Symmetry: D3
Subunit: 232 residues, 6 copies
């Protein structure tokens, strides 16, 4: 399947490295989302309910904070796991790298499947708010599958793990948990998040073929090497 | 968690690029497998039954053939998706690359979780054979979660997609289907395969930090560029 | 959808009143059967298990006897419910009527859906025998949905109820139970039987438009009126 | 079981052909409705949820319109499927026929089971409105099983199919979909609708034994034959 | 496990016979409550829904009345089952006996498990009221497992059955139904009530070892013997 | 309901303290067992499968050993939990006490419900052996609900806890686990065991009203007091 019309490197070069033609064929790659009446969807509902009961815990507080993140806030959200600030102030080359792949992982890697299924999101299915909003706030009710935010989270984790392998496990756990936070908060079904990690991993392979990404990745690594020297 | 004792680059340099210390912490990263009595496991059983009914179709024939693959046969199993033979004969540098990461993706990336849960495999749970064996053949009954073979399949797909981005979607679909073949054949539960793609993607990030992998990857790309020239 | 190729009144005028062109479009009318992984199929399995536990009861004995019936034996199987023998000996016009619609209800009304889904039957799904057979006996393993026998049973009940309205409820219960006997015995899933009653009822409407059926139905009614006179 | 007290041909000869004594014994014929805690009811809930998500589609719009139909509006609701207007204006004999069996199919054929189980309807179970009402509108909350409207729909379809066999499949599909519209809108559980088609088919057999129905049916057929001549 | 801090005979000698050290180790004895995503919890939800539909029946009226009972009202709630008034007026020794074990059965026997799991109660899980309250009334939302009230109910039943064995079955049924009333009203999950009867039975064994309980029990029996003489 | 015909103190005074008239009305007290198609039974099956996977663990070994116990072996099976040998050699009065209530707890307390439902046992439902038998050994296939052995186990635990309150929690855990061993081994469904603890607790109340039991219980306590003196 061809990717549906949309933005890419030719329209937003600061948010995408890749063209529409280079997008992961998410529609062809991913299975369909669980249908109502499937055991798989019943499990999605179980994870929704589990998540809902976690909202009033420390993990729930983290989930609400994670759910407040825009696509652009994902990079900085890895700071503690990464071991140093991922900010425009402290790590401009790294922050530029991660910001510039937001569109590739969040949009291009998800668009085909997103637009085909236009899956209803949990909060909308139940007719309630999410963990970090009331009904005075407005969120898109559909396009749940796969999760763009989660795809960005996982893709970002994989790139960050390559830059700082000494904390790869902390980084990967953090990337994983960004996805789970969206399940806890009612933004996405578990299956949206599961599917997102597939396409999120796929787009990172594509990005490794892209000269601009390769260059910027090296700059981020060079920058990190200096950050390490000054810390030690 | 520390990776359990086992082989790595120091014992089998032809099958691993990475050391035990560089292994993905699969125990910490992955959730536990579905427990008996969970909706998640009921879905695993649904996928097992679905798979079982697919055994007598063309897709089932492919599943049985895929299930015959050893870890070393995975590389060549991508040939049609890749668009050219992945063999020692035709693409020695590529075949060497993919073979040398078998241990990293199949063993190191799965070992912690595998040994902790020692999960019973579907055929053993049901007391039956798999789609490609009778009970005269003997298979390990446990260590199901996550699937080592599937981790190799997905990691290999991600690397191959980077080498030949023009067929990234065919490659990724093939890598995905190697996992699903194991579900169809009764070797693994769906959740084993899902979990395997997480760690399979994670190890590819680690591999990108490894000088030997980086060098061999470039050799594979150089080789592929020549393969393209001679085909065109 | 057009009915698949097969027999009709032009090839077997003793077993069908209707032509292929007059067949109920079972493929278009019926929903698909429950898929593995659906709650609907889980219920089919519940009814299978319920049925299995009923096999060693009086109702189970009746189910095994009902399961021994060929399409041609259905007419006579209504005798007790009807209140008098439905035999070639005692009620030739009635027996002729009911026999001559076997193909219409059993084949024409089911063929499209049967051949499209080729659904696996319960005993085959579980790899076991039915309640009235061992594995030395051989039955078709597929084409479960909808049940031809059940369609004949229900269509026959509706026709019989019209002929003897004084025992319509006994007749209808009997027709219903012929379907349930097949669920108890493992020949069909509950949903096969449910679907069969839809098309079974539909074909009876078609039959009422057919001159030969209309004539033979009247002969059966005339015959029954005489049977009543001689009994009273 | 005897039919509970109520109207019949002796009290409302314009809405029933049949007497209370001629009613289908719905209590004896039908199984009980799914109990809370059964897999069958879990499936009813799945179909309710599926239906709910369909409310904002073209099929949902049709469902809301179908749900607006009173028993008397069912006849006309078949017009497009039938191929010509089923109205008092254009087809008075046909409209009279179908109107006069409303009580037989909607009431007599359902009353025993309806009054025994007094089953709670979906919207009432969930404490919400239906797809075509707000809570300012008031509907009966119980007597869900079986669906009277659906029984009328299916009985009407079977009669209409006999009158116009050339469009029997369109007619039958329409009759089927009237039932499904009630599931989509939250008026009835799937099982209410399934059960309704059983008794709906049963009552049509009884109606064929009734002189007044037979006469009026012939008038409807004669009328239709003239309608065909003037169209062609 | 040690019982968590709290009241016992040393602080409230009118409500407990036993010390903290004599408490049933409810945490060690009971399994954990069903987790969200378990079949066991799905059944708890089924019983909740079943209960909810029973609220508008005679049994529901009894459930609401039972749900109004405080721990101190349990004794008197057995009067009809016991065959004579269990009141301070009519049976002071009996009423004293049963009141004085409220803490032992309601608190000591449940505290360890209660405080460990702090399980959310049904009404709180669903965000609704119970059968006998509106949201203007306030109830604790957690500590559901096991049910203290049910433990008191069952322990009280076992003691009462010993005092009046001629009505042991009526008494035991009543004690059982006090638990079920809490399920019907939405105060507790079925599993809370099931677990409560385990610890409720356990504490009665402990109470039989306690001199003060033994003495008061004998006084209650002596009193009952006089009650029987005056009735006869 | 009256207890069905059978043995009691008048026929087997060494195995029962109580008469048929003193039996717990198990049919009236207990709910019916889960029906096939209920969520409750699906959970029973989950516990069966969970149990089956535990058979090859240390807990499974204990389960098989527990499953080897006859009713008469239950008393001695508490020895480790009790803290001293419960044998005819070492504690004749105690062993006599516990043996003499086998019929009361195992038979009288279960008979009504057992004979009414004649519930099929797990191993028979699945057509397999239990954890401690092959098919050369023969076990009763029905009468599963409630578990007589489990009722004896729990009743015995409650009596033992009264005799040695210092180890009440170890004793109660042991009694509980005797029930769970039967679930693990495939002798009983979880619900059989749950129900057994209800009637097991009930019969202990009745036993406390019986002079012979009271006397023998005191002898067991006197004996235990001497056992304690000689140990210390």
């Amino acid at each position: 399947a061809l990717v549906p019309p949309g933005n890419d490197v030719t329209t937003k070069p600061d948010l995408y490295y890749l063209t529409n033609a280079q997008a992961i064929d998410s529609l062809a790659l991913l299975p369909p989302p669980p249908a109502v009446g499937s055991i798989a969807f019943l499990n999605d509902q179980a994870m929704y309910e589990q998540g809902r009961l976690l909202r009033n815990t420390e993990r729930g507080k983290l989930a609400a904070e994670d759910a407040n993140l825009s696509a652009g806030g994902v990079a900085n959200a890895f700071s503690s796991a990464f071991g140093s600030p991922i900010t425009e102030k402290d790590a401009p080359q790294l922050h530029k790298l991660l910001t510039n792949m937001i569109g590739d992982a969040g949009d291009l890697a998800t668009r085909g499947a997103k637009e085909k299924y236009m899956r209803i999101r949990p909060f909308a299915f139940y007719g309630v708010s999410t963990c970090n909003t009331t009904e005075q706030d407005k969120l898109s009710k559909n396009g749940s599958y796969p999760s763009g935010h989660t795809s960005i989270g996982w893709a970002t984790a994989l790139v960050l793990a390559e830059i700082n392998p000494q904390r790869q496990n902390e980084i990967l756990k953090r990337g994983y948990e960004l996805g789970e936070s969206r399940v806890i908060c009612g933004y996405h079904w578990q299956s949206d998040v599961d599917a997102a990690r597939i396409v999120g991993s796929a787009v990172v392979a594509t990005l490794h073929t892209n000269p601009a990404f390769q260059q910027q990745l090296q700059k981020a690594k060079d920058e990190f090497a200096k950050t390490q020297k000054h810390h030690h």
